[PDB]
C-alpha cells in the first residue's frame, strides 16, 4: 500500500480540476497513457479516472513528462544489449513500436510478419523489419498489485481492478508467508518499501539480537566490510550505527502493527542492498501478503451458497490469519475555570476494574489485560452543584449523605476490546507539554490485540474474490482430501462469470502442483510466444509430472484435470462429479466486522436538532431518508413510520416519556409534533413570514394560532 | 397432487411457486419454498460440482470458423490496396466478417454443449438455470468480436480469443478501455436513476385509492405487443388482474366471458387468450372517476400478491418505486434454435457496400420481408422447417458483407446515417499522381472547398 | 395454526389495514386489561389478540 501510494499520481488538486467541474472524457484512457499509467487502476467512487498510478516503468523528465523505456529494434529486431531506451517521454515517438509481447525468435528476430504495433495511436499489422521499437516487456503499462496478478493475462480487466485493490488492503499478519506462485515481480517491491531493513552496505553479520543486528555498531566483519569501504561522513568502519535498530509493534495509519525479527543468522555475509529484517508482512524479504491454503470448489449448502466462504477451524487454529491491531486512546486534563480535573488514583465509586488495575495517578500498568469497561485512566472534574432538585436534597437527608461533588470522567475501555496494553505516553509541562493551550496532562495509551479470523470478514483472493466468512467448521467435518488432509476453504465452483477471473483457477491448480511438489514458482502475465494458451500446458505439465515425483497419483488426473475425489468429513463419501482443488493465496481485509457494528438504544442527541447523533463512532443512528420512507408509506399499516419519525427521533419529551412508558410496562403515549418542524417555523419566520398554523375549532368555527 | 416429471431449476420453481400461491396460502408456500431450497442445497452439494479452465471446453471448429475469417480479410484488403476497393470500404467489413464468425462461434460452442454434457456443469447449471448466462459463456470460450474503442468506434481487429488463451496485450488494453468506460458510467447513472424516482414519486405521489364508488364504464383496449411477428407479450399476462370494462367476447364460436368488472385472474387470462380474443377493454384509471386517485375498482390486482389493491394506499409512490428501480439496470441466441444463424426465413437480405467496396461486401441498413420465419434466409415459398406464410424484416444474427469469410458482423442485429470522410493517406513515400478520375470540381456536393 | 390463522384472518376480513388496527387496539386492551395477568411473556398480548381474533373470533 505504500508504494502504490507513493507512486500514485493525481489529477485533482489545486491547479487541477474538481470532480464536478470535470466530467468524463477527461477520465479516459487516452491512448497515450499506454505505458504510462496503469489503466487498471483506480479507485472508484467518483474518482474513477481521476487518480491513476504510475506504470511500472514510467518516469519523468525534468520537464515532468514521463520518458518511457523501450527497445530499439533494428531491421525490425531488438539487439537486447541496448540498456532499454529511456526516451519516448510522450507516446508520439511516432514510429513502429512494438508491444513488448512478441514471439521473438531466439536471437533477435521477430517472428510473425503480422506483428502489431501502435502507430500514431494506432495499432497496425506490421512486419518485422520495418519496426523500431519494442516495449521492454509485455507487463509495463500496468502498475503495483496489477502487473503482479499470478495469471493476469487471463482475466477480465476490471475484476483485476478489484484485485489490485484488495491487495492493497490486506492487513498484515504475524508471519504473512510468501505466496506460492507469484509473479516474480516483487522482491523488489518489498525492497523498496522501506519497510524492511536493508544491508546498507556490507559486512558479515555478527551480533543480532532481536532488536538489532550488531553486525553493525558491534564492529566485526558485518559492520566491517562495514569496514571494507567506508562511507563519506558515516561511521566508516567501526561497530557502526549500522546499528540498525529494529522496531517492534508500532501502530500503523490503520492501527496495524509492524516489526522486523533479525531474520539473518550470525557471522555471515551480506552485501549492500540485501535485506536484513522484515517488515510487517514481507517475508523472505519479499512481499508476502497473505497465505495459501487448500481450497476446493464446491457448493457447500447455505454457507458458501453464494458470496459466502467456509473455513476449517485449523485455519486460524494454526494462528494463520490473525492479526494484530493496536490502539491510540488519549485523554487529557484541562483547567476548567472550575479548576483542574484529575487523574487520581482515586475516584468515587470504585472496586475492581476501578481503583484496581489503576496506578497512583489512576493509569494502568503496561501490560495489563483489560476489558471492556475497565479504566484506562481515571480522572474526575470540579462538578460542585449550584443546581439540584429538592428530591435529591431529600434523599440525602434520608441518608443524609452529604454527597460528593466531582464528575469522574475516568477513561474506560469502551466495549469490544481486549488485549494487553502496550503503552502509555503522558504529556504535561514536564512530559513534552504537547497539549492544547491550558491542558495539563495528556495521556496516550496503546492497546493491542490479537485477533483471529472469525465469521464476518471480507477476505479475498488476488482476483476480485470479495467474500465473507459464514461458518467454520470444526475440522473433522470438511471433505478433507483423498489423503485425508482436510481441505479448508471452500469457495463456489462456477467461476470466471461477470468476474471473468478464470485466471484464478489457473493458478490454484498450479499452486497445488508446487504445493504437492512443495516448490514455489514465479511467472508473468501474457505467457505468449506460444500459439496455444502456453500457461495451459505449463500447468498441466507441471502437475503431470508432479505425480510421479511422488507417485501419490491422485496429485494429477489428466481425465478431469486436477479433479479429485473427496470425501466428506461428515459422513464419508465423494460424489458423481470430482471437484478441483488447489492451493490458493488468500488474504484478509482490513475492514473488519468490528470496524462496522453499531447499535443504539438511545444516546446523545444533536445540538440543534436533537436527533440522535448519528455519526459512526459513537452511538450513532440509522438515517431514514425519503427513499427509505418510500418503503414505509408504500407498505400498509404505517404507524411505525410515524412514530419512527418522531419518538425515536424528535418529540423531545416524546422521546423520553416513551422510553419510560415502556419501562412502566404498558404501551406508549400519542406523539406530538416533532421538532424540526418547529424549527422550520422559526427560520421561515425569520424571514418576513406570518405563519398561522392554526386551528378552526368551535361550532363557531374558531380560528386561532399556537406555539 | 400433480406429480411432475421435469428438470426443475430456474423458472420451473418460479411458476411453480405462483401456482402454489394461488392455490394455497402464502404461508404454506413459504414454507414450501423453504423446504425445497433446502433440497436444493443439499443435493447440490452432493453432487459436488466444480469448474475449471479445462471445464471451459472449447468448441472445436473454433478453429476453422476463425482463420477462415482471416482469409476473408485477405481478399478484403486484396482489392483494397488494389484500389478496386478501399478503406472506409473494405475496412467496414474486415469488420463485418469478424462479427459474423462471432456468431459462427456462438453457435459451434453452444450447439456443441447442447449435444454433450451428461449432467456436466455447463448443462447442470449453465444452459439450464444458474448464474451462467451465455453472454459471458460465449467468451468464456468464444471469440470476442470487434467490441470498440473508448468511445463508439468499433476497433478493427476483433478480440480474437477468449479467456482461456488469455489475451495478449493489446487486447488487454482494449478490453480495458471498455471496462473503464463501463465504469465511469456506472458511477453516474447511479444517481440518474435515483433521481428519477424521486421525481416520479413526486409527480405520482398520492393517487391513493380512495374510493370504490368511482363510476363510468369506459376503458381501453389492449393487445399483445408485437413488434414484427415477434409478439412481445402474450396478451395473456398483459391482462393480468385488471377489470374488464365490458364482456371479453370470444369468437362467438363460444359465448360470453367475463362480463364486466371482472378482476381478471390469470387462468382466465391464459385461456381467453386461447379463445383468441384480440383486445379487451379494461377500466383504465387513465379514465374512471376517483378524486385525486384511481377508482379502487378501476385499478385492479396489486402485483404485490396478484390480488386487487387494498384501500387508502398511495399506489402512486408505489408505481414510482416499481418503475424507478430497475431503471438502474438499463444496460445503457441460445437453445440453439438453429445455430448462430437466426430466424432465416426464405433466402435474402439487403445492405450497403460503398463504405465496404471489397467486391460482394457490405455493412448494414435494414431488412425487408417475406417472413416464413424458417431456415432459407428471408422470402416466401416455404423452407424445410415449419410451413405457414408470413412477411417482414427478420432478425438474422448472420447479417452482411458476404462471407469473404465467416460472417459479416452480426452482433448488432436490426431485424440516422450521417457523413464521414475517407482517409486516402500517402500509402508510401513517392511521386503521387492521380488520374482516370480527377476531382470533378465544385462547390455544390462537398460545400465550397 | 396461528400462522394459517394469521393468514385466514386477513384472507377473509376488512381492509388489511382495517383489520390490523383492530387487532391492534385489541391487544392493546388485551395488554391494558388483564395487565400482566398470565405472564404472557410468550403469548404476547398481540399474539393473543391475533389467535382470539383469527380462531376464537372466527
Amino acid at each position: 500500500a505504500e508504494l502504490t501510494h507513493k507512486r500514485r499520481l493525481s489529477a485533482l488538486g489545486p491547479g487541477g480540476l474538481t470532480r464536478e467541474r470535470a466530467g468524463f472524457a477527461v477520465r479516459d484512457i487516452h491512448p497515450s497513457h499506454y505505458g504510462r499509467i496503469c489503466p487498471i487502476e483506480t479507485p472508484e467512487g467518483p474518482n474513477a479516472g481521476l487518480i491513476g498510478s504510475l506504470a511500472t516503468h514510467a518516469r519523468v523528465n525534468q520537464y515532468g513528462f514521463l520518458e518511457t523505456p523501450f527497445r530499439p529494434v533494428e531491421n525490425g529486431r531488438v539487439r537486447f544489449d541496448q540498456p532499454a531506451a529511456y526516451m519516448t517521454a510522450d507516446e508520439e515517438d511516432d514510429l513502429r513500436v512494438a508491444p513488448g509481447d512478441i514471439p521473438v525468435d531466439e536471437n533477435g528476430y521477430i517472428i510473425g510478419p503480422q506483428v502489431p504495433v501502435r502507430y500514431r495511436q494506432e495499432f497496425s499489422t506490421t512486419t518485422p523489419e520495418q519496426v523500431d521499437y519494442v516495449a521492454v516487456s509485455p507487463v509495463q503499462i500496468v502498475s503495483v498489485a496489477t502487473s503482479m496478478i499470478p495469471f493476469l493475462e487471463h482475466d477480465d480487466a476490471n475484476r483485476a481492478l478489484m484485485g489490485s485493490n484488495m491487495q492493497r488492503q490486506a492487513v498484515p499478519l504475524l508471519k504473512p508467508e510468501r505466496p506460492l506462485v507469484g509473479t516474480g515481480l516483487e522482491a523488489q517491491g518489498a525492497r523498496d518499501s522501506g519497510m524492511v531493513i536493508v544491508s546498507r552496505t556490507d559486512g558479515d553479520v555478527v551480533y543480532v539480537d532481536a532488536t538489532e543486528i550488531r553486525v553493525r555498531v558491534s564492529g566485526q566483519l558485518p559492520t566491517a566490510s562495514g569496514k571494507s569501504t567506508d562511507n563519506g561522513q558515516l561511521t566508516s568502519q567501526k561497530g557502526q550505527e549500522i546499528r540498525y535498530t529494529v522496531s517492534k509493534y508500532q501502530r500503523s495509519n490503520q492501527d496495524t502493527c509492524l516489526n522486523q525479527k533479525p531474520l539473518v543468522r550470525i557471522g555471515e555475509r551480506v552485501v549492500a542492498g540485501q535485506v536484513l529484517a522484515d517488515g510487517s508482512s514481507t517475508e523472505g524479504g519479499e512481499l508476502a501478503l497473505g497465505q495459501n491454503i487448500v481450497v476446493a470448489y464446491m457448493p457447500w449448502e447455505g454457507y458458501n451458497y453464494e458470496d459466502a466462504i467456509l473455513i476449517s477451524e485449523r485455519l486460524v487454529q494454526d494462528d494463520i490469519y490473525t492479526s494484530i491491531h493496536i490502539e491510540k486512546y488519549e485523554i487529557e486534563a484541562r483547567q476548567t475555570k472550575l479548576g483542574p480535573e484529575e487523574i487520581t488514583r482515586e475516584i468515587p465509586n470504585v472496586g475492581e476494574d476501578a481503583l484496581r488495575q489503576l496506578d497512583e495517578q489512576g493509569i494502568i500498568r503496561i501490560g495489563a489485560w483489560v476489558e471492556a469497561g475497565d479504566i484506562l485512566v481515571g480522572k474526575v472534574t470540579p462538578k460542585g452543584e449550584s443546581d439540584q432538585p429538592p428530591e435529591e436534597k431529600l434523599l440525602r437527608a434520608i441518608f443524609g449523605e452529604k454527597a460528593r461533588d466531582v464528575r469522574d470522567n475516568s477513561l474506560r475501555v469502551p466495549n469490544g476490546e481486549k488485549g494487553r496494553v502496550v503503552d502509555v505516553r503522558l504529556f504535561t509541562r514536564e512530559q513534552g507539554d504537547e497539549l492544547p493551550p491550558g491542558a495539563n496532562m495528556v495521556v496516550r495509551v496503546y492497546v493491542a490485540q490479537k485477533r483471529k479470523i472469525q465469521v464476518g470478514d471480507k477476505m479475498a483472493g488476488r482476483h476480485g474474490n470479495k467474500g465473507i466468512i459464514s461458518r467454520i467448521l470444526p475440522i473433522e467435518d470438511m471433505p478433507y482430501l483423498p489423503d485425508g488432509s482436510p481441505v479448508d476453504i471452500v469457495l463456489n465452483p462456477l467461476g470466471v462469470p461477470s468476474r471473468m477471473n478464470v485466471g484464478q483457477v489457473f493458478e490454484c491448480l498450479l499452486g497445488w502442483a508446487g504445493h504437492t511438489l512443495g516448490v514455489r514458482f514465479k511467472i508473468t502475465p501474457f505467457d505468449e510466444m506460444y500459439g496455444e494458451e502456453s500457461s495451459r500446458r505449463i500447468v498441466h505439465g507441471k502437475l503431470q509430472e508432479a505425480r510421479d515425483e511422488t507417485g501419490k497419483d491422485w496429485v494429477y488426473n489428466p481425465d478431469d484435470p486436477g479433479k479429485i475425489m473427496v470425501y466428506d468429513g461428515r459422513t464419508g463419501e465423494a460424489f458423481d462429479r470430482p471437484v478441483t482443488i488447489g492451493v490458493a493465496y488468500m488474504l484478509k481485509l482490513v475492514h473488519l466486522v468490528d470496524d462496522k457494528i453499531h447499535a443504539r438504544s438511545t444516546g446523545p442527541y444533536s445540538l440543534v436538532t436533537q436527533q440522535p447523533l448519528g455519526g459512526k463512532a459513537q452511538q450513532g443512528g440509522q438515517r431514514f431518508g425519503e427513499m427509505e420512507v418510500w418503503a414505509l408509506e408504500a407498505f400498509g399499516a404505517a404507524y411505525t413510520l410515524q412514530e419512527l419519525l418522531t419518538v425515536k427521533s424528535d418529540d423531545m419529551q416524546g422521546r423520553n416519556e416513551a422510553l419510560n412508558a415502556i419501562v412502566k410496562g404498558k404501551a406508549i403515549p400519542r406523539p406530538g409534533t416533532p421538532e424540526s418542524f418547529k424549527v422550520l417555523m422559526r427560520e421561515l419566520q425569520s424571514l418576513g413570514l406570518d405563519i398561522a398554523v392554526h386551528k378552526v375549532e368551535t361550532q363557531a368555527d374558531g380560528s386561532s394560532l399556537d406555539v | 397432487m400433480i406429480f411432475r416429471n421435469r428438470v426443475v431449476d430456474k423458472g420451473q420453481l418460479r411458476n411453480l411457486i405462483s401456482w402454489a400461491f394461488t392455490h394455497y396460502g402464502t404461508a404454506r408456500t413459504a414454507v414450501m419454498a423453504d423446504k425445497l431450497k433446502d433440497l436444493g442445497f443439499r443435493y447440490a452439494t452432493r453432487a459436488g460440482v466444480s469448474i475449471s479452465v479445462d471445464d471451459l471446453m472449447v468448441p472445436p471448429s473454433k478453429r476453422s470458423l476463425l482463420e477462415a475469417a482471416e482469409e476473408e480479410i485477405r481478399a478484403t484488403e486484396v482489392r483494397y490496396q488494389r484500389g478496386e476497393i478501399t478503406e472506409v470500404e473494405r475496412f467496414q467489413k474486415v469488420i463485418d466478417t469478424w462479427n459474423g464468425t462471432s456468431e459462427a462461434l456462438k453457435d459451434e460452442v453452444v450447439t456443441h454443449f447442447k449435444q454433450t454434457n451428461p449432467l456436466n456443469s455447463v448443462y447442470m447449471m449453465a444452459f439450464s438455470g444458474a448464474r451462467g448466462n451465455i453472454s459471458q459463456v460465449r467468451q468464456l470460450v468464444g471469440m470476442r468480436g470487434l467490441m470498440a474503442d473508448p468511445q463508439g468506434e468499433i476497433i478493427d481487429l476483433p478480440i480474437k480469443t477468449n479467456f482461456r488463451e488469455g489475451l495478449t496485450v493489446t487486447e488487454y488494453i482494449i478490453s480495458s478501455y471498455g471496462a473503464r468506460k463501463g465504469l465511469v458510467d456506472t458511477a453516474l447513472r447511479t444517481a440518474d436513476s435515483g433521481y428519477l424516482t424521486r421525481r416520479l414519486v413526486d409527480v405520482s405521489q398520492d393517487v391513493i385509492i380512495r374510493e370504490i364508488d368511482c363510476g363510468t364504464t369506459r376503458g381501453i383496449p389492449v393487445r399483445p405487443m408485437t413488434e414484427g411477428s415477434k409478439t412481445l407479450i402474450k396478451l395473456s399476462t398483459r391482462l393480468l388482474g385488471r377489470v374488464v370494462g365490458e364482456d371479453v367476447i370470444h369468437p362467438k364460436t363460444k359465448e360470453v366471458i367475463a362480463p364486466r368488472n371482472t378482476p381478471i385472474s390469470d387462468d382466465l387470462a391464459k385461456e381467453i387468450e386461447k379463445a383468441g380474443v384480440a383486445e379487451v377493454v379494461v377500466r383504465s384509471p387513465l379514465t374512471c372517476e376517483a378524486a385525486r386517485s384511481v377508482c379502487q375498482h378501476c385499478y385492479g390486482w396489486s402485483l404485490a400478491h396478484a390480488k386487487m389493491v387494498d384501500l387508502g394506499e398511495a399506489v402512486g409512490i408505489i408505481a414510482a418505486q416499481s418503475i424507478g428501480e430497475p431503471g438502474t439496470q438499463l444496460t445503457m441466441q441460445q437453445v440453439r434454435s438453429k445455430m448462430d444463424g437466426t430466424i432465416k426465413l426464405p433466402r435474402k437480405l439487403r445492405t450497403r457496400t460503398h463504405r465496404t467496396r471489397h467486391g460482394e461486401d457490405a455493412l448494414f441498413v435494414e431488412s425487408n420481408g417475406i417472413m416464413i420465419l424458417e431456415p432459407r434466409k428471408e422470402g416466401s415459398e416455404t423452407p424445410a422447417p415449419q410451413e405457414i406464410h408470413v412477411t417482414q424484416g427478420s432478425t438474422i444474427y448472420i447479417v452482411d458483407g458476404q462471407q469473404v469469410k465467416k460472417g459479416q458482423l452480426l452482433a448488432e442485429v436490426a431485424l440516422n446515417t450521417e457523413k464521414a470522410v475517407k482517409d486516402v493517406a500517402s500509402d508510401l513515400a513517392g511521386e503521387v499522381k492521380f488520374a482516370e478520375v480527377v476531382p470533378e470540381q465544385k462547390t455544390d456536393r462537398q460545400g465550397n472547398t | 395454526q396461528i400462522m394459517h390463522r394469521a393468514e385466514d384472518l386477513i384472507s377473509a376480513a376488512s381492509n388489511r389495514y382495517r383489520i390490523t388496527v383492530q387487532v391492534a387496539n385489541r391487544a392493546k386492551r388485551r395488554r391494558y386489561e388483564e395487565f400482566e395477568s398470565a405472564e404472557d411473556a410468550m403469548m404476547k398480548p398481540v399474539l393473543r389478540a391475533i389467535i382470539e381474533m383469527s380462531d376464537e373470533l372466527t
Binding site: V629, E633, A637, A638, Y639, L641, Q642, L645, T646, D651, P671, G672, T673, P674, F677 | Q205, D206, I208, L311, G312, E313, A314 | N15, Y17, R18, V21, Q22
Partner: peptide, 21 residues
C-alpha cells in the same frame, strides 16, 4: 394528505385516519 403528515408528524390519510376516519 400525505408527505406532510410526514413532514409534520401526524400520521397519514390512511391509518386510523382511514379507520376512525
Amino acid at each position: 394528505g400525505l408527505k406532510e403528515n410526514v413532514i409534520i408528524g401526524r400520521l397519514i390519510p390512511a391509518g386510523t385516519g382511514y379507520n376512525t376516519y
